Design a protein around this ligand. Structure first.
Ligand SMILES: [Ca+2]
Length: 736
């Protein structure tokens, strides 16, 4: 059975600075691969390294980039050309068309029209094989570009080899940062030149310079194939040579089959059927995008044991390491998806986090590859705790707990999004104030309160002193400190305790991030009942919820002075103020379940799935955000979602397919059977779990893992009675 046929690596590529439909590039890679490869249409340095509307490719590039905003590191490219040996990234570039291109996760091919050259590539976790098919020509070349900001290159003709290192990066790296690469050709060089700050230096073997490059060449006959085996390491040249062994002596066809198999192994853990082709493509493309980040950042020693270059301190050290994710995005459902479907993989990642804390003094929030200043919150706490409570348990629990506590009373001296900026005010006042020069203060406070609930959970589980458990149980309620009873919304609060005026509920940023009050107010994952209580009961809560959808997409952009692309993206979708791309709001629709109206979740969730995601190049309604926006679709299509990681619950939405089968790593399987599902029948009339009537609006992790059958009776009419009882409600801390 193949699922890769449904994966479109071009989904999200039709994006620009001005307007996102995913801001992705085609990651040709193994799952969680250390090195990704992509065709490169953008100029060196441009975060938009591949865009669908671009006409020319100027290299095939090794990349580690998680988003255009974060940008790249450990990057170099290769480009086959004919005619004159030219290094310049414009002069060497070639027209292509998407109809001369084949993009899959395990194999990429393109016809370079201006050189009459076909390029094919098939990666492994750390290496890749290139096959170039050249035309008849006296002057055929391959250009190797080590990029700028200080690089190195060496041509070794007696070995048909080129080695080099690249350092261009976007921050978050140690001083000794390098990515060492080795390229072996199966055709010997008849022409050889290094490049030094744009000057071709024929027969000069080596360069150490700002922007090193190499051009080798030969005569080719029509249809002549030249293969290049490439690997890189963050450790050393000898380690890169070891990494090359992943290629064995395989050809393109053999490596493509191994990558296809690797992908089918992970994609095939979730088998959907009884939908249409657009849905299959959307689903598996989103699943593919959910299994890329964070990437492996470890390599294998002579004994097959993991070692890694430390992006935190520059040492080479034993153990697992992963990077390139922002927990502000990925705590929400991306990491939970791994705890459900791929826990063995998150086990490695969690050990990597322990290594991050050991190496750098902090758990990461945004890492690429080292600590990076981006977004907000202490959501590493959610990641660590959710794993543990779901049985993904690190070896050194003591260090894990100490790391967590460390993060509640420290902020990283250089990277303000690492640790807790404003923790002094928060610990003292119960909130980060609006008028103390700490922006995003309300968003930080709300996420910290949830984060402290996660810590409370773990402290209780670990049998910590009652004094510690009480501290964090109290901090978990800090969300109440920003609730404005007058507007029924969250509101920035001055240091002196008064709420800030004038108050603008539609103003994006400022007190919040990636949205306004209407978007962030719902960020009480651990205590929705508490929020319902604050607003005066379930009827008023639903009145407020419903109003998000019913109003026009009006906004206040005065924080920015202009309509930023995230605001534009909301305005065009015809969903009121529900801006699906803003991460803080993505769990929102599930909250209808907690207010006794699950049928409203069913209605709106289905609207989002049918309208906000498409399988084409312009697929997503905003940035994909390293798996979070994709994993949202994966979960929601199955019919449930981890509103509150750290609990064992998935909150019920509405399934998209007539049938979905989950295959768990523990060897058990779960069938979600919804035979009456259709475009019209998106309401849950009733539901059973292994035959037992199930009116609850949540499912438990442990019960799913036991396997069996969930049967969902789908209807075109809402069932106004199902899921409204007290015992049907998912978890709230206030009730606990
Ligand atoms: Ca977003």
């Amino acid at each position: 059975k193949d699922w890769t046929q449904y994966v479109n690596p071009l989904m999200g590529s039709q994006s620009t600075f001005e307007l996102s439909t995913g801001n992705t590039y085609p990651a040709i890679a193994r799952p969680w691969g250390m090195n990704f490869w992509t065709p490169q249409t953008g100029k060196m340095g441009d975060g938009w390294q591949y865009t669908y509307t671009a006409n020319k490719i100027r290299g095939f590039k090794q990349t580690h980039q998680p988003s255009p905003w974060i940008n790249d590191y450990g990057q170099f490219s290769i480009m086959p050309i004919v005619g004159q040996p030219v290094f310049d990234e414009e002069k060497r570039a070639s027209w292509f068309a998407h109809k001369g291109e084949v993009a899959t996760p395990y194999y990429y091919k393109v016809y370079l029209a201006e050189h009459d050259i076909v390029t094919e590539m098939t990666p492994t976790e750390r290496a890749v094989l290139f096959r170039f098919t050249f035309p008849e020509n006296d002057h055929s070349y391959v250009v190797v570009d080590a990029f700028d900001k200080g690089s190195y290159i060496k041509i070794i003709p007696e070995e048909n080899k080129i080695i080099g290192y690249t350092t261009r990066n976007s921050g978050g790296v140690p001083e000794n940062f390098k990515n060492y690469f080795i390229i072996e050709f199966d055709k010997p060089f008849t022409y050889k030149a290094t490049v030094e700050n744009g000057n071709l230096q024929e027969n000069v073997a080596e360069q150490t310079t700002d922007h090193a490059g190499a051009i080798i060449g030969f005569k080719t006959r029509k249809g002549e194939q030249v293969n290049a085996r490439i690997a890189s390491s963050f450790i050393s040249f000898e380690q890169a040579a070891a990494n090359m062994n992943e290629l064995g002596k395989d050809n393109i066809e053999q490596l493509a089959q191994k990558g296809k198999d690797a992908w089918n192994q992970v994609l095939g853990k979730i088998e959907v059927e009884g939908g249409n082709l657009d849905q299959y493509r959307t689903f598996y493309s989103c699943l593919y995008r959910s299994l890329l980040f964070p990437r492996k950042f470890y390599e294998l020693d002579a004994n097959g044991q993991p070692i890694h270059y430390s992006p935190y301190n520059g040492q080479v050290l034993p153990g697992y390491m992963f990077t390139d994710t922002g927990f502000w995005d990925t705590f929400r459902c991306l990491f939970p998806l791994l705890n459900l479907m791929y826990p063995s993989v998150n086990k490695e990642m969690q050990e990597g986090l322990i290594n991050t804390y050991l190496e750098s003094g902090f758990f990461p929030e945004w890492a690429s590859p080292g600590h990076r200043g981006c977004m907000v919150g202490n959501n590493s706490a959610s990641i660590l705790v959710d794993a543990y409570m779901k049985g993904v348990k690190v070896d050194d629990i003591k260090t894990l707990y100490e790391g967590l506590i460390h993060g509640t009373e420290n902020v990283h001296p250089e990277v303000s999004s690492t640790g807790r900026l404003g923790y002094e005010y928060y610990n003292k006042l119960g909130y980060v104030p609006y008028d103390v020069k700490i922006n995003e203060n309300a968003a930080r406070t709300l996420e910290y309160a949830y984060d402290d609930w996660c810590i409370y959970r773990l402290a209780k589980e670990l049998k910590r002193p009652k004094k510690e458990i009480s501290l964090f149980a109290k901090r978990a309620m800090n969300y109440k400190n920003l609730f404005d009873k007058e507007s029924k919304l969250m509101r920035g609060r001055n240091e002196d305790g008064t709420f800030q005026s004038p108050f603008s509920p539609l103003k994006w940023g400022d007190a919040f991030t990636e949205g306004n009050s209407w978007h962030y107010t719902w960020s009480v994952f651990h205590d929705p009942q508490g929020l319902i209580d604050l607003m005066g009961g379930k009827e008023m809560f639903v009145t407020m919820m419903d109003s998000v959808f019913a109003v026009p997409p009006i906004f206040d952009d005065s924080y920015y002075g202009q309509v930023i692309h995230e605001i534009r993206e909301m305005t065009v979708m015809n969903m009121g103020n529900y801006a699906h791309g803003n991460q803080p709001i993505q769990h929102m629709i599930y909250l209808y379940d907690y207010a006794g109206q699950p049928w409203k979740a069913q209605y709106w969730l289905r609207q989002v799935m049918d309208r906000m995601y498409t399988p084409g190049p312009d697929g997503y309604c905003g940035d994909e955000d390293n798996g979070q926006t994709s994993a949202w679709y994966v979960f929601s299509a199955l019919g449930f979602y981890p509103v509150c990681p750290g609990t064992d619950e998935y909150v019920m939405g509405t399934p998209l397919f007539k049938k979905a089968t989950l295959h768990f790593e523990n060897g058990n399987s779960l069938v979600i059977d919804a035979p009456n599902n259709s475009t019209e029948n998106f309401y849950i009339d009733s539901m059973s779990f292994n035959g037992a009537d199930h009116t609850k609006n949540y499912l438990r992790h442990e019960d799913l893992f036991k396997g069996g059958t969930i049967k969902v009776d789908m209807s075109n009419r809402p069932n106004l009675n199902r899921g409204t009882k007290e015992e049907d409600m998912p978890y709230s801390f206030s009730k606990e």
